[PDB]
Scaffold this active site. Structure first.
Site, short mmCIF file in Angstrom:
data_model
loop_
_atom_site.label_atom_id
_atom_site.label_comp_id
_atom_site.label_asym_id
_atom_site.label_seq_id
_atom_site.Cartn_x
_atom_site.Cartn_y
_atom_site.Cartn_z
N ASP A 25 46.74 47.07 22.36
CA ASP A 25 46.78 46.13 23.47
C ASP A 25 45.44 45.41 23.49
O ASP A 25 44.37 46.06 23.50
CB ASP A 25 47.00 46.88 24.82
CG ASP A 25 46.91 45.96 25.99
OD1 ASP A 25 47.66 44.98 26.04
OD2 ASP A 25 46.14 46.22 26.92
N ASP B 180 42.96 43.13 25.52
CA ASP B 180 42.70 42.62 26.84
C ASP B 180 41.42 41.77 26.83
O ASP B 180 40.33 42.26 27.28
CB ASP B 180 42.56 43.77 27.80
CG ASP B 180 43.91 44.45 28.07
OD1 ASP B 180 44.90 44.07 27.43
OD2 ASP B 180 44.00 45.39 28.93
N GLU C 4 39.27 39.10 28.35
CA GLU C 4 39.15 38.48 29.66
C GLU C 4 37.92 37.61 29.62
O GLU C 4 36.86 38.08 29.99
CB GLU C 4 39.02 39.58 30.76
CG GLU C 4 40.38 40.23 31.06
CD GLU C 4 40.33 41.24 32.19
OE1 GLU C 4 39.70 40.96 33.24
OE2 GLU C 4 40.95 42.29 32.01
N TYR D 246 47.48 39.69 39.50
CA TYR D 246 46.68 40.30 40.57
C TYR D 246 45.24 39.79 40.40
O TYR D 246 44.96 39.00 39.49
CB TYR D 246 46.74 41.85 40.54
CG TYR D 246 46.71 42.44 39.15
CD1 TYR D 246 45.53 42.42 38.38
CD2 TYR D 246 47.85 43.06 38.60
CE1 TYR D 246 45.48 42.98 37.11
CE2 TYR D 246 47.81 43.62 37.33
CZ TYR D 246 46.61 43.55 36.59
OH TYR D 246 46.53 44.13 35.36
C1 PNX Z 1 30.91 47.15 39.08
C2 PNX Z 1 32.13 46.38 38.49
O1 PNX Z 1 33.03 47.00 37.93
C3 PNX Z 1 32.21 44.83 38.56
C4 PNX Z 1 33.06 44.24 37.41
C5 PNX Z 1 33.23 42.71 37.55
C6 PNX Z 1 33.12 41.99 36.16
N1 PNX Z 1 33.84 40.68 36.18
C7 PNX Z 1 35.17 40.67 35.77
O2 PNX Z 1 35.76 41.71 35.41
C8 PNX Z 1 35.82 39.44 35.81
C9 PNX Z 1 35.21 38.21 36.20
N2 PNX Z 1 36.09 37.22 36.12
C10 PNX Z 1 37.21 37.80 35.69
N3 PNX Z 1 37.03 39.13 35.50
C11 PNX Z 1 38.02 40.06 35.04
N4 PNX Z 1 33.92 38.15 36.57
C12 PNX Z 1 33.42 36.80 36.95
C13 PNX Z 1 33.20 39.43 36.58
O3 PNX Z 1 32.02 39.49 36.90
C1 PNX Z 2 44.40 34.74 38.07
C2 PNX Z 2 43.06 34.59 37.39
O1 PNX Z 2 42.90 33.70 36.57
C3 PNX Z 2 41.89 35.55 37.79
C4 PNX Z 2 40.56 35.11 37.14
C5 PNX Z 2 39.51 36.22 37.46
C6 PNX Z 2 39.42 36.62 38.98
N1 PNX Z 2 38.13 37.39 39.22
C7 PNX Z 2 36.94 36.70 39.56
O2 PNX Z 2 36.97 35.48 39.69
C8 PNX Z 2 35.75 37.45 39.73
C9 PNX Z 2 35.73 38.86 39.58
N2 PNX Z 2 34.47 39.28 39.82
C10 PNX Z 2 33.72 38.19 40.13
N3 PNX Z 2 34.49 37.09 40.07
C11 PNX Z 2 34.07 35.69 40.34
N4 PNX Z 2 36.90 39.55 39.22
C12 PNX Z 2 36.93 41.06 39.03
C13 PNX Z 2 38.06 38.82 39.01
O3 PNX Z 2 39.06 39.44 38.71
#
Ligand code: PNX
Ligand code: PNX
Ligand code: PNX
Length: 570
Positions: free
Chosen positions: A290, A292, A294, A370
């Site tokens: 898988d 993933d 991101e 989600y």
């Molecule tokens: C402490 C902790 O687990 C914070 C993790 C946040 C990291 N993160 C994302 O995972 C993320 C994200 N945008 C999409 N995703 C999935 N950003 C902006 C981010 O910081």
């Molecule tokens: C539906 C979609 O495109 C979600 C994109 C990531 C959403 N997201 C964040 O934006 C994010 C984040 N942490 C910080 N930030 C700014 N995480 C965990 C996240 O999932």
């Protein structure tokens, strides 16, 4: 006429041997800790304390001769190789010119990572998980996280496996640039640096070898000499109980995706695909891979990375190249291997990949429906809604309008339906899409009544920060709460609200919330009603099924609703 050998059980590692050699009492680089051998090395000491020793020995497994050698005194060490995992009845015979004398049989174990030396796992599942008779062709997936065995105290034998078709094991990291992991704090980055010592960049490693194969679990019958322990040995015994269950390692995830941005260089993809192949030859309980990432194009954890021109074609090339590799493995083993990926479903993530092209190489796409809204800012919204909520502004749903400063919306709003429709519109077939369910809430503090523009909808308020809470209440990081914690401490037995919380449901969006008007705590999550709506939606569109994130946070209610929703959609 020699004296029949007596086997020295303690001097022969308790007759526990293994095709895979795993370091059990240290933490070091992956290539130092894990070595898979096509033949297990067997070493058995035996004694002939009285009488004559004779001059040669033969070793039998279940009556079949497997080794021979010299005896030249009253203690002999028999060393030989054997290629097949399993439990066998071993006898050792000593011979001289006049005859042979065989030892009594004793069971020897040769571990292999398909679990062929293991009995089916004994389960200990919360009985709030009910039994269903769901069509076995519908995907019913979940993620099990490696770190769930610590404070969350959720082990492999806790999973309601008979209600699952796919277990995605979160997560396998990739050596290389990993600044996003560092930014998370705790020991994740340090663990990763250790695991990658002596490892080429862009190869996969196990992040936490203690969780994966060192930790002794009593419920699984693990002993000191057991050659494979940890979550992986339990997943092996699980495949013995449920041979049709697919268990798939998930590589990457939100904080571990940094190295994928270098997959625009094909040599990095080759190194990675080769390491995945070796990984699936080493850990044979796994049934595919898988991916993933991101996210292709950026907008994830790595603020300084992402290439909207090149990441999509790199992702499609990666999927083609993985599929080629998995075809070799299917050729070598006679097994079926699956290739899947969990993807962002905001329009701005989708637009950076031609998924209709990628998906011809793939069995399923797990659509991450989600995390649409969350504590990373102070704007409330439904993090996992099917449709556009009441709080949204004119033209926000389809991206036709302007925000509160008059700025045009850049694309459709973040909802599950918008994401699924955009993917279908690209030409992804519905029967390859798996719709995601949240087994957790995201939330905020400070959304009190004076911030609301519609006094009956807290999604129209403004927060002061992320939800704060203790691990006892299922809050393991700020802004995030296990579903079972929401149920215990916010909803209560009757789903009407306790501890200062009230329950609400946005029927337009198909999304629940709990709100504490005084603290302004507001949590968006999936409940029984919204998960039934998701099941009905998936059924209507002929989607492959449903999956959830993450299994340790459920108490049974969400996975039960997934199965009920798939049965009952009309
Ligand atoms: C402490 C902790 O687990 C914070 C993790 C946040 C990291 N993160 C994302 O995972 C993320 C994200 N945008 C999409 N995703 C999935 N950003 C902006 C981010 O910081
Ligand atoms: C539906 C979609 O495109 C979600 C994109 C990531 C959403 N997201 C964040 O934006 C994010 C984040 N942490 C910080 N930030 C700014 N995480 C965990 C996240 O999932
Ligand atoms: C600390 C150790 O023994 C190995 C690294 C584990 C990786 N890890 C986490 O421990 C973790 C986590 N989120 C919460 N926690 C507690 N993530 C995302 C993670 O990768």
């Amino acid at each position: 006429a020699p004296t029949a050998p007596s086997i020295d059980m303690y001097g022969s590692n308790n007759l526990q041997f293994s095709k895979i050699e795993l370091a059990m009492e240290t933490t070091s680089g992956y290539n130092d800790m894990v070595k898979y051998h096509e033949l297990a090395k067997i070493k058995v000491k035996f004694n002939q304390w009285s009488g004559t020793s004779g001059d040669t020995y033969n070793v039998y497994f279940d009556g079949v001769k497997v080794a021979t050698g010299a005896i030249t005194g009253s203690q002999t060490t028999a060393s030989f190789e054997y290629g097949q995992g399993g439990l066998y009845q071993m006898e050792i015979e000593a011979c001289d010119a006049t005859g042979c004398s065989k030892s009594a049989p004793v069971e020897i174990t040769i571990a292999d990572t398909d679990g062929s030396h293991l009995k089916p796992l004994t389960m200990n599942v919360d009985p709030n998980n009910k039994s269903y008779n769901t069509d076995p062709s519908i995907v019913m997936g979940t993620y099990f996280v490696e770190w769930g065995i610590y404070g969350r105290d959720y082990t492999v034998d806790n999973m309601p496996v008979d209600n699952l078709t796919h277990i995605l094991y979160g997560f396998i990291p990739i050596c290389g640039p990993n600044e996003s992991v560092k930014s998370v704090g705790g020991n994740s980055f340090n663990a990763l640096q250790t695991a990658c010592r002596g490892v080429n960049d862009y190869e996969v490693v196990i992040h936490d070898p203690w969780a994966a194969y060192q930790k002794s679990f009593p419920q699984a019958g693990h002993e000191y000499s057991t050659p494979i322990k940890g979550n992986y040995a339990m997943l092996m015994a699980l495949k013995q109980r449920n041979p049709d269950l697919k268990i798939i390692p998930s590589i990457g995830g939100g904080t571990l995706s940094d190295p994928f941005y270098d997959f625009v260089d094909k040599k990095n993809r080759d190194t990675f695909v080769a390491s995945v192949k070796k990984f699936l030859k080493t850990w044979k309980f796994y049934d595919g891979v898988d991916i993933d990432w991101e996210f292709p194009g950026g907008g994830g954890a790595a603020a300084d990375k992402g290439d909207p021109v090149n990441d999509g074609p790199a992702y499609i090339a990666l999927m083609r190249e993985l599929r080629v590799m998995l075809d070799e493995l299917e050729a070598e083993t006679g097994r079926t291997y699956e290739l899947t990926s969990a993807i962002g479903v905001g329009y701005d993530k989708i637009e950076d990949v031609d998924y209709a092209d990628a998906v011809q190489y793939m069995d399923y796409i797990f659509a991450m429906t989600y995390d649409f809204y969350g504590g990373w800012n102070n704007v409330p919204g439904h993090q996992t809604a099917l449709y556009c909520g009441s709080f949204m502004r004119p033209g926000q749903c389809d991206g036709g309008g302007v925000d509160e400063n008059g700025e045009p919306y850049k694309g459709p709003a973040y909802t599950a339906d918008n994401g699924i429709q955009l993917l279908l519109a690209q030409g992804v077939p519905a029967n390859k899409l798996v719709l995601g369910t949240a087994m957790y809430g995201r939330g905020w503090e400070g959304v009190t009544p004076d911030t609301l523009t519609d006094p009956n909808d807290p999604m129209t308020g403004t927060a002061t920060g992320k939800l704060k809470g203790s691990t006892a209440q299922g809050v393991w990081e700020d802004g995030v709460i296990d579903y079972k914690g929401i149920k215990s401490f916010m909803l209560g037995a009757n789903n009407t609200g306790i501890n200062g919380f009230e329950y609400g449901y946005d029927a337009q969006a198909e999304a629940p919330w709990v709100w504490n008007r005084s603290t302004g705590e507001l949590i968006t999550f999936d409940d029984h009603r919204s998960v039934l709506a998701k099941g009905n939606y998936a059924k209507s569109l002929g989607l492959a099924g449903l999956f959830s994130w993450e299994i340790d946070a459920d108490n049974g209610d969400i996975l039960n609703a997934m199965h009920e929703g798939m049965a009952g959609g009309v």
